[PDB]
Design a protein around this ligand. Structure first.
Ligand SMILES: Cc1ncc(COP(=O)(O)O)c(C=O)c1O
Ligand SMILES: Cc1ncc(COP(=O)(O)O)c(C=O)c1O
Lengths: 409, 406
């Protein structure tokens, strides 16, 4: 028995991404076939160390407080607790003129991105970096901003793809980039790990101003920056007139399963007609969201105490040391290794090889999982993404195995 | 300035003034009459604490995130398997709902907007009148409507299905034009009416005959005290036409914790025979990364036989409050609907505007209610009144209404 409801066209357009389902199938199979040998993963980018007890303890207490009259509350502001918003403003945007009432607390970036796309609607054009983070492009297709997927080029019609690679220091050539209503920009980037420089961000803000575009700037990896490169786009004067920033506690503090992030919508960000965009994001939030979990919001606040930040910084130094082990290994083997410094991802170029064949080689001969760059679009072909999340003894063993393998080869 | 054109669907969306306005009137009244205790029977938020049994599991799970053995990052976007199985067994026992047809959400508001993303702009919808804002607002935002026709107080291109005492709060199918989608909330907000087995049978058949789907909102099912049905999948064949949406919010006081679910049956097919479940999976993967792992732990603890017993007991407190209010209002000669199977009373003042009754009750008793007008034209002449709240507020408000309506 069938219905007469017509499948949303935007679903017919949307191509499935087989990347992670494949990685996972291949990981299982390989673990099953070689129970002999500990498989190690440098692939998925989930955080792995526990959240500090200081932070968690505030989440356990708040939860217990919900069983008391003095601590019980129902619905909170859909925008998020005021204490948490003031803390995000002060912690991440000190002196950048971000008001606590421009912060919108989310259950993380994935949802936030889809809510921004609902705000924007079907009748806008977008630009994304290539290699491309799935969320921006998938959400764009689903809401109706694109045509079909052009199989030969591996690009959706009506979408500007901006190549970012070693040849252009991972920043598009803005003089040859067509104009769009919206530009998505992720820095530090997933998958390349590149953090744009102050000069590059200046140019992006000016390009946006000149084109009347808005920037959706994804800073979910900012806490990994070690250069002194900028962490928020609002470090650039005038960014507030063109840019929305999206971020997360996911990778910063391991809240991947706890679910907490935010977006910034400046006061000064205006449509064609002079109406502040912030007023309408409020209405999108009220209509499609009832707030981040109260217990997650208490955890978030505890992340931003001086004690929370100190403990989190310490977990992130562990991850930083792991990346160095891996970058030093791969560079010592003559590989062209990008990223690694300011992000938890290394982006390794195997000029002349398909990402998948290198994945296969490395999996079969070292029992290590990586991520095929191909999976992120055509600008990822020939690269692998490699993660510094994981335990130290696994990074060290993986380093040993790669040494052995590539000195063969 | 920027060159971005405002989404047209935002220009279509009228602000609903209802709650912001009740709120403004409350604050204004407390400010002019600070010498009196204002009492609210307006907002439908739960107010009793969540049982310590449930909460304790959420605290333990949270402490477990600071351990190697208990640290958990990303879960399945669809939700923990243990939680889905428990929702299936607890709420759909014997109704052929599989654990893999359950999609765990951060509650109905989000879930509704994700269903509307799935469905898209090119569908027509039917909603009950009086109307729950979420369904209609989400429909406008995604592009399913024309502008708001001020005279009729209806969005163009939307079928409004009057439900009132004259048709036992069930739409007259002979006067209901066909749509792609029918939204049906039972127990209803705002009227509190729970459709009967026979009504639901008719609705499922109507849907089959029209090739429509039903989005059935059972968030208030746990308040049903009749033996009326709690899920639409009690009706044979519902599984070929209906999606069900629900929540821990009012059931267990998780309004601020954020947890719900939807059911998308295997058997629910588009025009072309494709299972809708395959595409909701892709919507969920794309627009969501899961409900909070802590909230999902709380949810699972709600559905233990110990959790359910404790939740039932908080809901009896509310049930006793409703009885105080109903017995008072009815003992005074008011026409009271709802109340029995939902936490909301729907009180008719034939001949009066909702807002003028609101004004009267606010000025003379310092009590806040919800003007039925706010929910659309089928709410005109009614007030919605809530049984959530502390007992002593219910009692005092009951005393004041006794004095006033005498
Ligand atoms: C590019 C990027 N942005 C944002 C996020 C944060 O996602 P969420 O907050 O939904 O975990 C991630 C996590 O993988 C990511 O890779
Ligand atoms: C009709 C209706 N459905 C569903 C919900 C649950 O919403 P949430 O789960 O987002 O709190 C409510 C709560 O207001 C409601 O009134």
């Amino acid at each position: 028995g069938s219905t007469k409801l017509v499948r949303n066209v935007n679903l017919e357009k949307l191509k499935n991404n087989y990347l992670f389902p494949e990685i996972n199938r291949r990981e299982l199979e390989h673990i099953e076939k070689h129970p002999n040998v500990q498989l190690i993963s440098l692939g998925t980018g989930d955080t792995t160390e526990p959240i500090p007890e200081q932070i968690t303890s505030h989440m356990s207490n708040f939860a217990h407080g919900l069983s008391t009259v003095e601590g019980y509350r129902g619905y909170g502001l859909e925008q998020g607790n005021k204490t948490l918003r003031k803390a995000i403003a002060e912690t991440f945007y000190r002196d950048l003129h971000v008001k606590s009432n421009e912060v919108f607390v989310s259950d993380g970036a994935q949802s936030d991105i889809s809510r921004l796309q609902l705000l924007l609607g079907s009748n806008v054009t977008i630009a994304v970096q290539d290699p491309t983070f799935p969320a921006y492009i998938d959400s764009s297709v689903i809401i109706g901003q694109t045509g079909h997927f052009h199989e030969k080029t591996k690009k959706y019609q009506n979408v500007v793809y901006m190549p970012c690679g070693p040849n252009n220091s991972f920043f598009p050539d803005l003089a040859m980039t067509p104009r769009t209503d919206v530009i998505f920009f992720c820095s530090p980037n997933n998958p390349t790990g590149y953090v744009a420089s102050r000069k590059q961000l200046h140019q992006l803000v000016d390009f946006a101003k000149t084109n009347g575009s808005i920037i959706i700037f994804d800073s979910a990896y900012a806490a990994f920056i070690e250069d002194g490169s900028p962490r928020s786009i609002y470090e650039i004067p005038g960014a507030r007139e063109v840019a929305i920033e999206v971020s997360s506690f996911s990778k910063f503090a391991g809240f991947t399963g706890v679910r907490l992030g935010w977006s910034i919508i400046p006061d000064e960000l205006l449509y064609s007609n002079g109406f502040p965009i912030i007023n309408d994001f409020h209405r999108i939030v009220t209509t499609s969201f009832n707030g981040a979990s109260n217990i997650a919001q208490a955890g978030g606040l505890a992340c931003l105490s001086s004690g929370g930040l100190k403990e989190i910084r310490s977990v992130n130094n562990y991850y930083k040391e792991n990346r160095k082990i891996l970058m030093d290994t791969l560079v010592s083997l003559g590989l062209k290794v990008y990223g690694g410094v300011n992000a938890p991802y290394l982006w390794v170029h195997f000029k002349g090889s398909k990402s998948w064949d290198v994945f296969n080689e490395i999996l079969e001969n070292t029992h290590i999982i990586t991520v095929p760059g191909s999976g992120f679009g055509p600008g990822g072909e020939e690269y692998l993404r490699i993660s510094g999340f994981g335990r130290r003894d696994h990074i060290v063993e993986a380093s040993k195995r790669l040494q052995n393998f590539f000195n063969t080869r």
